[PDB]
Design an enzyme around this catalytic site. Structure first.
Site, short mmCIF file in Angstrom:
data_model
loop_
_atom_site.label_atom_id
_atom_site.label_comp_id
_atom_site.label_asym_id
_atom_site.label_seq_id
_atom_site.Cartn_x
_atom_site.Cartn_y
_atom_site.Cartn_z
N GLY A 127 2.83 35.67 20.00
CA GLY A 127 3.81 35.24 19.02
C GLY A 127 4.24 33.83 19.34
O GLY A 127 4.00 33.33 20.44
N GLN A 155 10.51 27.07 19.50
CA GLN A 155 9.72 26.79 20.69
C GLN A 155 8.87 25.54 20.55
O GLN A 155 8.37 25.03 21.57
CB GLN A 155 8.83 27.99 21.02
N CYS A 204 6.98 34.61 28.46
CA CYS A 204 7.36 33.80 27.31
C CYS A 204 6.69 32.44 27.46
O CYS A 204 6.68 31.87 28.55
CB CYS A 204 8.88 33.63 27.26
N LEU A 205 6.16 31.92 26.35
CA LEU A 205 5.52 30.61 26.39
C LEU A 205 6.50 29.49 26.73
O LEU A 205 6.06 28.41 27.14
CB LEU A 205 4.83 30.32 25.07
N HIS A 222 11.55 39.79 20.53
CA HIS A 222 11.42 38.54 21.29
C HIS A 222 11.46 37.32 20.38
O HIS A 222 12.14 36.33 20.68
CB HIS A 222 10.12 38.62 22.09
N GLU A 223 10.75 37.36 19.25
CA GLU A 223 10.69 36.20 18.37
C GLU A 223 12.02 35.97 17.67
O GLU A 223 12.45 34.82 17.50
CB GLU A 223 9.58 36.37 17.34
N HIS A 277 14.46 34.22 19.85
CA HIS A 277 14.27 32.77 19.90
C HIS A 277 14.99 32.06 18.76
O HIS A 277 15.46 30.92 18.94
CB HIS A 277 12.78 32.42 19.83
C1 LIG Z 1 4.88 40.64 24.39
C2 LIG Z 1 5.78 40.42 23.19
C3 LIG Z 1 6.80 39.34 23.50
C4 LIG Z 1 6.16 38.13 24.16
C5 LIG Z 1 5.68 37.04 23.18
C6 LIG Z 1 5.24 35.84 24.00
C7 LIG Z 1 5.04 34.60 23.13
C8 LIG Z 1 6.37 33.92 22.93
O1 LIG Z 1 6.93 33.34 23.84
N1 LIG Z 1 6.91 33.95 21.73
O2 LIG Z 1 8.19 33.43 21.73
C9 LIG Z 1 3.94 36.16 24.68
O3 LIG Z 1 2.88 36.11 24.08
N2 LIG Z 1 4.05 36.52 25.95
C10 LIG Z 1 2.89 36.94 26.71
C11 LIG Z 1 3.07 38.37 27.12
O4 LIG Z 1 4.10 38.74 27.69
N3 LIG Z 1 2.10 39.21 26.75
C12 LIG Z 1 0.87 38.87 26.04
C13 LIG Z 1 0.47 40.18 25.37
C14 LIG Z 1 1.18 41.29 26.13
C15 LIG Z 1 2.22 40.64 27.03
C16 LIG Z 1 1.78 40.83 28.48
O5 LIG Z 1 2.95 40.87 29.31
C17 LIG Z 1 2.74 36.03 27.93
C18 LIG Z 1 1.58 36.50 28.81
C19 LIG Z 1 2.56 34.56 27.58
ZN LIG Z 2 9.04 33.46 23.87
#
Ligand SMILES: CCCCC[C@H](CC(=O)NO)C(=O)N[C@H](C(=O)N1CCC[C@H]1CO)C(C)C
Ligand SMILES: [Zn+2]
Ligand SMILES: CCCCC[C@H](CC(=O)NO)C(=O)N[C@H](C(=O)N1CCC[C@H]1CO)C(C)C
Ligand SMILES: [Zn+2]
Lengths: 172, 172
Positions: B48, B53, B93-94, B135-136, B139
């Site tokens: 996401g 962001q 989180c990115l 999460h989104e 933000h």
């Molecule tokens: C998971 C749902 C909420 C997290 C969304 C975030 C992206 C984000 O920061 N959006 O604001 C993400 O992709 N985070 C990833 C993440 O936490 N992921 C990726 C898919 C599953 C989960 C693994 O912990 C990390 C690895 C960058």
């Molecule tokens: Zn995030």
């Protein structure tokens, strides 16, 4: 002490499929490698990194699940001595950027290895540590987490990785 | 259709703490932004991305849990209308590179939103999708996942993020 952050290899690089060779010399160049591996792992937002992922065919991995220096783990020439249970984990890999999938791994594992100075140790992990230990040892045997997925899921991971590579080529 | 991969902001950038404003105009500029957000999300290995962001103060997020075009979700001016349960999720989180922690979120959520063309729709998600929707939307309200952690865990995430920034400065 430190030299360079290293390039992480992505599938389908054949070096990710080689069976890594045991470490047999504990000298300063090994310490520099280990330090650069930690730097590379943190810089790539990972919690582990195996030497084949940077093109070094050695049975060596660095791990930090917590994310600070007191919990750093180095496994040299590891062997799984026991494992128990099965557990689903949501997992990614620095060598398969963008692919996230559920995989089944042992819930508890005990690993015997040498530490970064060549001295024997054992560690028993559950949860993320158990998952990471199994993931890193798999890399030492040329195995990646997508290999255990269905053909459909492997195809989708391949498509996601291919799209990632195309976007990286358009990044400034 | 596509313009440029965007820079993702990290804590403590104040733009991550601003309350995003509703989207009011569905024009070509909005479509280009959405397309660039998807590119930026995939290129950063996320599932996401929210407009704050990338420094755009709009209540807009792109989501792809699976990783293919058929499952792309765009939420514009979203509102959580209901949720059920509480579940632990391992999350990153990115905008907080390197930090991974367990957080508690609703297990099921229902969101009303406008799609990428401004058509109202409703979506119910469980599991990863539910976690991502929450999460989104956080933000868009200037909230990041570290805020709900204990002071100890927030400090550890800060220091891990500071180390990441130092390594990024030493990357070639
Ligand atoms: C998971 C749902 C909420 C997290 C969304 C975030 C992206 C984000 O920061 N959006 O604001 C993400 O992709 N985070 C990833 C993440 O936490 N992921 C990726 C898919 C599953 C989960 C693994 O912990 C990390 C690895 C960058
Ligand atoms: Zn995030
Ligand atoms: C989790 C233990 C096994 C995975 C180890 C990998 C690193 C790796 O590729 N070693 O070979 C990792 O950090 N993967 C990350 C990952 O899957 N993480 C990060 C911590 C938790 C978990 C989220 O699903 C992604 C986001 C790069
Ligand atoms: Zn890996």
């Amino acid at each position: 002490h430190h030299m360079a952050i290293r390039k992480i290899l992505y599938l389908p690089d054949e070096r990710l499929r080689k069976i890594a060779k045991p470490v047999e010399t504990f000298d300063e160049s090994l310490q520099t490698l280990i330090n650069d591996m930690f730097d590379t792992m943190y810089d790539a937002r990972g919690v582990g990194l195996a030497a084949p992922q940077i093109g070094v065919s050695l049975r060596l991995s660095v791990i930090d699940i917590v994310g600070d220096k007191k919990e750093q783990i180095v496994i040299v020439n590891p062997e799984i001595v026991s494992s128990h249970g099965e557990k689903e984990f949501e997992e990614g890999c620095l060598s398969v950027p963008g692919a996230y999938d559920t995989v089944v791994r042992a819930e508890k594992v005990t690993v015997k290895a040498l530490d970064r100075f060549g001295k024997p140790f054992e560690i028993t992990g559950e949860g993320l540590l158990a998952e990471c230990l199994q993931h890193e040892i798999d890399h030492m045997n040329g195995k990646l987490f997508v290999d255990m997925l269905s053909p459909l899921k492997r195809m989708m991971a391949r498509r996601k990785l291919d799209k990632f590579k195309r976007l990286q080529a358009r990044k400034p």
